[PDB]
PDB file of C-alpha atoms and ligand atoms in Angstrom:
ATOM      1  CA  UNK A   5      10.657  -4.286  16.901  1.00  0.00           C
ATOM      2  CA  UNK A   6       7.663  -4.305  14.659  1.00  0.00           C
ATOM      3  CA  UNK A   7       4.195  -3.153  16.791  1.00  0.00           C
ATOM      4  CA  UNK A   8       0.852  -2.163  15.731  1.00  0.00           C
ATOM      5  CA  UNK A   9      -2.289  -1.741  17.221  1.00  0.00           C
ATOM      6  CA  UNK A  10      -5.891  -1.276  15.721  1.00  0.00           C
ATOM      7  CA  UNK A  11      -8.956   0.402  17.967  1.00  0.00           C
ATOM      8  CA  UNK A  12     -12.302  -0.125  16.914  1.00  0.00           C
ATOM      9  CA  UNK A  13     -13.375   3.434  17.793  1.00  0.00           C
ATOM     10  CA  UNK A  14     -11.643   6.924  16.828  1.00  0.00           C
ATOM     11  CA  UNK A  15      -9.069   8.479  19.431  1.00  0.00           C
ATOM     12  CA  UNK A  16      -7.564   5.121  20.763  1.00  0.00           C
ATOM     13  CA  UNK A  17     -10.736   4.138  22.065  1.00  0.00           C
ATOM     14  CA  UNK A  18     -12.887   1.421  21.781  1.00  0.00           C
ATOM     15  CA  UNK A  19     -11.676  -2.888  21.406  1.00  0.00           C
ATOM     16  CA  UNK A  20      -8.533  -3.039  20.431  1.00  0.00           C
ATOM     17  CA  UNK A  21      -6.319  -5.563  19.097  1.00  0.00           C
ATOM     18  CA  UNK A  22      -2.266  -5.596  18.673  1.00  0.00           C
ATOM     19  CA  UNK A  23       0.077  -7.327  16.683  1.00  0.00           C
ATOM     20  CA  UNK A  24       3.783  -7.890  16.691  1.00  0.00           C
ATOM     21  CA  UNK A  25       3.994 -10.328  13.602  1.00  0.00           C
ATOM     22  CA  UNK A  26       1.903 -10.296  10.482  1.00  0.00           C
ATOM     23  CA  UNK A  27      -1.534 -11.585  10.942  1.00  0.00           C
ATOM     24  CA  UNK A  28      -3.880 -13.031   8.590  1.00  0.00           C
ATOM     25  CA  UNK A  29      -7.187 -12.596  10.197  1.00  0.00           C
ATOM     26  CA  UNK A  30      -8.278 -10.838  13.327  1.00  0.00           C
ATOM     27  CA  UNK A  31     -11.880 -10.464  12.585  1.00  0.00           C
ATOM     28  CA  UNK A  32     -12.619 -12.489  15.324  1.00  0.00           C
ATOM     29  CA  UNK A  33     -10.839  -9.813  17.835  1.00  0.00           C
ATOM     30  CA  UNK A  34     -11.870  -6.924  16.424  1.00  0.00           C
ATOM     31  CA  UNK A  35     -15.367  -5.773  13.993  1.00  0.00           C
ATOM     32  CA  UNK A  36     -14.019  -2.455  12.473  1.00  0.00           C
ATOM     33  CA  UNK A  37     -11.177  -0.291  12.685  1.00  0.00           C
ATOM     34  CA  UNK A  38     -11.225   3.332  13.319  1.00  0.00           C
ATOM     35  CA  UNK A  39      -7.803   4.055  15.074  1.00  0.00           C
ATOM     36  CA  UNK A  40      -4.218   2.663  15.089  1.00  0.00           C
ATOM     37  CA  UNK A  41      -0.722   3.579  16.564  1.00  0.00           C
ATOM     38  CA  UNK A  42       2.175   1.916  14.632  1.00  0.00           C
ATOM     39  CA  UNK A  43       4.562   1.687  17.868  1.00  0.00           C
ATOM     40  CA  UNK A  44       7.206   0.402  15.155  1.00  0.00           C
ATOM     41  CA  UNK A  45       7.813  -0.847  11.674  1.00  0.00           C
ATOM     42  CA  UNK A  46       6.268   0.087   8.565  1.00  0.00           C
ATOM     43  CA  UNK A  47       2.991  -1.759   8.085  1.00  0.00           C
ATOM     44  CA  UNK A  48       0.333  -3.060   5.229  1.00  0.00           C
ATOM     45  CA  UNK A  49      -3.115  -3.169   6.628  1.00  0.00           C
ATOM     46  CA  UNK A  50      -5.955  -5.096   5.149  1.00  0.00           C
ATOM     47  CA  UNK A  51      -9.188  -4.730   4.338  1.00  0.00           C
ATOM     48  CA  UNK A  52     -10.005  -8.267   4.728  1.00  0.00           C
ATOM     49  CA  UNK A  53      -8.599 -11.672   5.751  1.00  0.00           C
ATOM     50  CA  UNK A  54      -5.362 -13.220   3.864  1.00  0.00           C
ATOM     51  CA  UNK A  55      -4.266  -9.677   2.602  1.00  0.00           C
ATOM     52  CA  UNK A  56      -7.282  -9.101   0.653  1.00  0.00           C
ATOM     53  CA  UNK A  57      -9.011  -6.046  -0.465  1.00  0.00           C
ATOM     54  CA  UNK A  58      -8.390  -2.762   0.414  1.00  0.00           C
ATOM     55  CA  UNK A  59      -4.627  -1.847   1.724  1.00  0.00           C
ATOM     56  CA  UNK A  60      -2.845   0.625   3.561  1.00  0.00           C
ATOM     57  CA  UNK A  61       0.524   1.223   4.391  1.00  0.00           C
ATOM     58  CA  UNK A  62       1.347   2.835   7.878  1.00  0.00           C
ATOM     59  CA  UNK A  63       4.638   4.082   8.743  1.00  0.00           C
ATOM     60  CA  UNK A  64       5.374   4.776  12.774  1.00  0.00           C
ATOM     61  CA  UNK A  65       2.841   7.082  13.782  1.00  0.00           C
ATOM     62  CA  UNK A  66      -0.678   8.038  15.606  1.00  0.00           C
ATOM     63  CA  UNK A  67      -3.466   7.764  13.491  1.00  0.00           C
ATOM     64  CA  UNK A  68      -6.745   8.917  15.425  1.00  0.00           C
ATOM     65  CA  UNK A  69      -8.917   8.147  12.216  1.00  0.00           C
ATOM     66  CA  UNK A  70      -8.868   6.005   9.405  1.00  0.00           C
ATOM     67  CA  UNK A  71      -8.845   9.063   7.410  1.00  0.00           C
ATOM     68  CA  UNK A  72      -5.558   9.763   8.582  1.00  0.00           C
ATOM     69  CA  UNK A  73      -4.067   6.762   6.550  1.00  0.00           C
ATOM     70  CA  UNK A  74      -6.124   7.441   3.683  1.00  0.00           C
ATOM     71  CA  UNK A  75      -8.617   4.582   4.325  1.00  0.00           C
ATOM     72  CA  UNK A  76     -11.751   3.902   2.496  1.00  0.00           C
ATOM     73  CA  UNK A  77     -13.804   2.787   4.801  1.00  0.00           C
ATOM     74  CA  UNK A  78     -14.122   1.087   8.354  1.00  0.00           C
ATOM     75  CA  UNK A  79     -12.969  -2.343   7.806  1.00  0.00           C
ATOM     76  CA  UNK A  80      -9.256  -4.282   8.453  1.00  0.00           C
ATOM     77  CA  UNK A  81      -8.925  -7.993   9.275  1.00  0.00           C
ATOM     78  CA  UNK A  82      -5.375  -8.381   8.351  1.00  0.00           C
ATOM     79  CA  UNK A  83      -1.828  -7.195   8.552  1.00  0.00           C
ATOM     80  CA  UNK A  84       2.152  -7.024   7.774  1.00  0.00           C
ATOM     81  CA  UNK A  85       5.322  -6.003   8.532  1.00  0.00           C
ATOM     82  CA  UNK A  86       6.831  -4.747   5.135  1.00  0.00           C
ATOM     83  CA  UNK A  87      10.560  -5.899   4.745  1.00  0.00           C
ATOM     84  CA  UNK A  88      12.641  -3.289   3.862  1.00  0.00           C
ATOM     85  CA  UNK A  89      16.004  -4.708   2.079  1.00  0.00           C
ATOM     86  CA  UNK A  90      19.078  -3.932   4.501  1.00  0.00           C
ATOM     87  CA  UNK A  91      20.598  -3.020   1.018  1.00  0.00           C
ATOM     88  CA  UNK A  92      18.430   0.156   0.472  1.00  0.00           C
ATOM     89  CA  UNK A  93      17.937   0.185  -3.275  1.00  0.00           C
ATOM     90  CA  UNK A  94      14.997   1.176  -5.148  1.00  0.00           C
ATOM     91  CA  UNK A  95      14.354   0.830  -9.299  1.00  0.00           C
ATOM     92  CA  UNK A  96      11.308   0.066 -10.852  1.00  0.00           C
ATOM     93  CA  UNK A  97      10.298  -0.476 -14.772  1.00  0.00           C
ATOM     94  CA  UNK A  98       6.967   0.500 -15.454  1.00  0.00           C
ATOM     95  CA  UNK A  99       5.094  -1.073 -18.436  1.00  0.00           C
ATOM     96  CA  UNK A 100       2.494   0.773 -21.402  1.00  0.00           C
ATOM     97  CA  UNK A 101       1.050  -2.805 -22.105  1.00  0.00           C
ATOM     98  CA  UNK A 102       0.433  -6.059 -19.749  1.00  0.00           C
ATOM     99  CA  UNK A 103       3.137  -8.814 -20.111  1.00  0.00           C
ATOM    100  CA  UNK A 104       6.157  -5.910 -20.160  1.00  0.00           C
ATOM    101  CA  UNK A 105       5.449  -4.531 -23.641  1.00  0.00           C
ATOM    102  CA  UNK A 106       5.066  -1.445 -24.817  1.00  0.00           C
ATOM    103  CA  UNK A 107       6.990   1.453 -24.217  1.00  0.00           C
ATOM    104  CA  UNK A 108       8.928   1.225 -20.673  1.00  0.00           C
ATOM    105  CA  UNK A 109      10.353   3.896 -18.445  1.00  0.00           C
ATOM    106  CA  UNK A 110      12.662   3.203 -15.699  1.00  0.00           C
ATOM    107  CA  UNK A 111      13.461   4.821 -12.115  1.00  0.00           C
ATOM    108  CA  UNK A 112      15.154   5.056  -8.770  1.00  0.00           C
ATOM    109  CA  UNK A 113      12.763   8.425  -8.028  1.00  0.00           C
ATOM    110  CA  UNK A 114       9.404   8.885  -6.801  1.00  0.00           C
ATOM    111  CA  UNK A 115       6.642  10.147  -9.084  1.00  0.00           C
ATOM    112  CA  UNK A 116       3.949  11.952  -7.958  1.00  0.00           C
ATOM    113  CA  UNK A 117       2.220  13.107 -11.645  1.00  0.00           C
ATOM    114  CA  UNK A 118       2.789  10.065 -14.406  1.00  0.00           C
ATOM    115  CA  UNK A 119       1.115  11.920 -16.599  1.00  0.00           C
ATOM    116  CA  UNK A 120       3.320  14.836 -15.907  1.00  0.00           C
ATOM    117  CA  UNK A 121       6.367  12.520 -16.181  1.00  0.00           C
ATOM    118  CA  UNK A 122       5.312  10.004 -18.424  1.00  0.00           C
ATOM    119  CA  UNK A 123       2.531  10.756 -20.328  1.00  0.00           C
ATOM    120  CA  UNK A 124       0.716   8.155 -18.762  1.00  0.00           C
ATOM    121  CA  UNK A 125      -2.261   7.722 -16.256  1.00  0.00           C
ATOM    122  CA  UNK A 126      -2.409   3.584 -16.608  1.00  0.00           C
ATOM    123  CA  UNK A 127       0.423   1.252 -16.046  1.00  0.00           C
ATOM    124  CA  UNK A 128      -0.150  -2.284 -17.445  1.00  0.00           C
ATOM    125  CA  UNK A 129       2.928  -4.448 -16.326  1.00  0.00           C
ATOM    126  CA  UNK A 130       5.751  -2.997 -13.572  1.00  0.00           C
ATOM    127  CA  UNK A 131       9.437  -4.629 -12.810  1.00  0.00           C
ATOM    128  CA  UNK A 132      10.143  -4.250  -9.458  1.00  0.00           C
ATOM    129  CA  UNK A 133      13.852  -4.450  -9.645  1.00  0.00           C
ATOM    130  CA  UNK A 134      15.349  -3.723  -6.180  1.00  0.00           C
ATOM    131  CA  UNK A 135      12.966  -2.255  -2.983  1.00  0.00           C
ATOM    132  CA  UNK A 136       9.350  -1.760  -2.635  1.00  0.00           C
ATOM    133  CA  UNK A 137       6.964   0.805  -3.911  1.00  0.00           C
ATOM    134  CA  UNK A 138       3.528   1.702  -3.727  1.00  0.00           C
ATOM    135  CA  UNK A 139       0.946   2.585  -6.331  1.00  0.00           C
ATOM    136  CA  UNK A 140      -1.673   5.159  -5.993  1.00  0.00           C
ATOM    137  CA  UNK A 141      -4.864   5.048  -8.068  1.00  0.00           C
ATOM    138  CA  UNK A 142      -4.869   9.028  -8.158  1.00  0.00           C
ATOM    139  CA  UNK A 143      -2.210  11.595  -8.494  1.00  0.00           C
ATOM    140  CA  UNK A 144       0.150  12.778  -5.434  1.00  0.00           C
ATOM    141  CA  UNK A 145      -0.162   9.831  -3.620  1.00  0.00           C
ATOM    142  CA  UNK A 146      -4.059   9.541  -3.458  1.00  0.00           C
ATOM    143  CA  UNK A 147      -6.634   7.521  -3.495  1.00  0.00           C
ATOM    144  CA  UNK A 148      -6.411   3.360  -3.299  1.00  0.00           C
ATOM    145  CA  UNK A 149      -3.116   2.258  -3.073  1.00  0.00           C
ATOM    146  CA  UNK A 150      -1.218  -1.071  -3.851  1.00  0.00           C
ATOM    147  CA  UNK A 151       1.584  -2.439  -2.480  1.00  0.00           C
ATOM    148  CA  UNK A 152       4.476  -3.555  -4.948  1.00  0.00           C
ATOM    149  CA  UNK A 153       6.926  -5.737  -3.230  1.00  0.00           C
ATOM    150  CA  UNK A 154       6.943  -9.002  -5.435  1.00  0.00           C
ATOM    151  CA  UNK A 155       9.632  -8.895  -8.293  1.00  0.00           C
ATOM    152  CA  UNK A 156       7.570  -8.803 -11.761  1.00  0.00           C
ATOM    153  CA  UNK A 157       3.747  -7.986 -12.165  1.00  0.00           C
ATOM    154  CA  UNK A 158       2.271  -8.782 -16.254  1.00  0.00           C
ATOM    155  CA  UNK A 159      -1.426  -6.876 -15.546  1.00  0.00           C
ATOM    156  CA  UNK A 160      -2.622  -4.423 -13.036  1.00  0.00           C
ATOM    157  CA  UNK A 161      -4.965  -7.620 -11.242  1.00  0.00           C
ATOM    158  CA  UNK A 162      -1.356  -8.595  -9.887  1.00  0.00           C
ATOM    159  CA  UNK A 163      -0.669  -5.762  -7.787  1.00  0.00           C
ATOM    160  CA  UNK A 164      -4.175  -6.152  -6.728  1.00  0.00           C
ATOM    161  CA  UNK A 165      -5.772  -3.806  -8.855  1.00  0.00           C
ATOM    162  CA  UNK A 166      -9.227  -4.411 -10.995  1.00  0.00           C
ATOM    163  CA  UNK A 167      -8.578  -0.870 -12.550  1.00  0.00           C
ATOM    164  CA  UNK A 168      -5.179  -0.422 -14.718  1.00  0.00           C
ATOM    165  CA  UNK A 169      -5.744   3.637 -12.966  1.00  0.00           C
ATOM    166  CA  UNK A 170      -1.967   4.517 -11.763  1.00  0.00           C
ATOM    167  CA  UNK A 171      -0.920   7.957 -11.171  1.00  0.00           C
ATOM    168  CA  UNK A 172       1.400   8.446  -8.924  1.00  0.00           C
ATOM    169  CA  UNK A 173       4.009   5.941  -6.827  1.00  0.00           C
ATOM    170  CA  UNK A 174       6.873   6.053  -4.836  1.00  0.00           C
ATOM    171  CA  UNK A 175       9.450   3.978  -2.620  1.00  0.00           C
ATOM    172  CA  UNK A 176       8.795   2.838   0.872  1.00  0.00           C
ATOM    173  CA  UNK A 177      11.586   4.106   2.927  1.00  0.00           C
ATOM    174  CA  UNK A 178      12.822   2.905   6.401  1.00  0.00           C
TER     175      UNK A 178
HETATM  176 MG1  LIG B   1       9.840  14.185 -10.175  1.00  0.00          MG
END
């Protein structure tokens, strides 16, 4: 099922490389990335090798730029398949203070303003309690996003984030 394919070039062009499994480093295929189709699947892209730096996530689609997946710049070296429970349930406690302290909010909704919501533009700690989310550096979805499909995250360095900036996040859905 799952199929993804990176171009080196805008418009499909260019050295490609394609992928039906995750894959931990295909630097040696492929020097930049400035195209993809996701044949399949919903997908987290990497900046760099072993899931490492900037990441993206792709649902099925064309993507003729890597503007069109909000990227940050031309580099990817590694990807996955995200697993979507067969269960379909999404709730997630977000955190005022690292190590689940603080004041804490709970959801099953997306949330495109936290500071509209919450009062909050920083999240220190997050339960992810059933599903997988995404948070977004910027409000509405923008800006550098971090995947959130572990169970329990105590500082914003575990979601892969040196800045505790969160403004917005929502589910992935199939
Ligand atoms: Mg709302």
């Amino acid at each position: 099922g799952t199929k993804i394919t990176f171009y080196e070039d805008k418009d499909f062009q260019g050295r490609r490389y394609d992928c039906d499994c995750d894959c931990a480093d295909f630097h040696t295929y492929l020097s930049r990335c400035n195209s993809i189709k996701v044949e399949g699947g919903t997908w987290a892209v990497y900046e760099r090798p072993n899931f490492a730096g900037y990441m993206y996530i792709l649902p099925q689609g064309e993507y003729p730029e890597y503007q069109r997946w909000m990227g940050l710049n031309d580099r990817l070296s590694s990807c996955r398949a995200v697993h979507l429970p067969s269960g379909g349930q999404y709730k997630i406690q977000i955190f005022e203070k690292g190590d689940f302290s603080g004041q804490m909010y709970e959801t099953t909704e997306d949330c495109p303003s936290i500071m509209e919501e919450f009062h909050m533009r920083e999240i220190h700690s997050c339960k992810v309690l059933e599903g997988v989310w995404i948070f977004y550096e910027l409000p509405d979805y923008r800006g550098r996003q971090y995947l959130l499909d572990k169970k329990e995250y105590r500082k914003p360095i575990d979601w892969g984030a040196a800045s505790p900036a969160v403004q917005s996040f929502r589910r992935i859905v199939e």
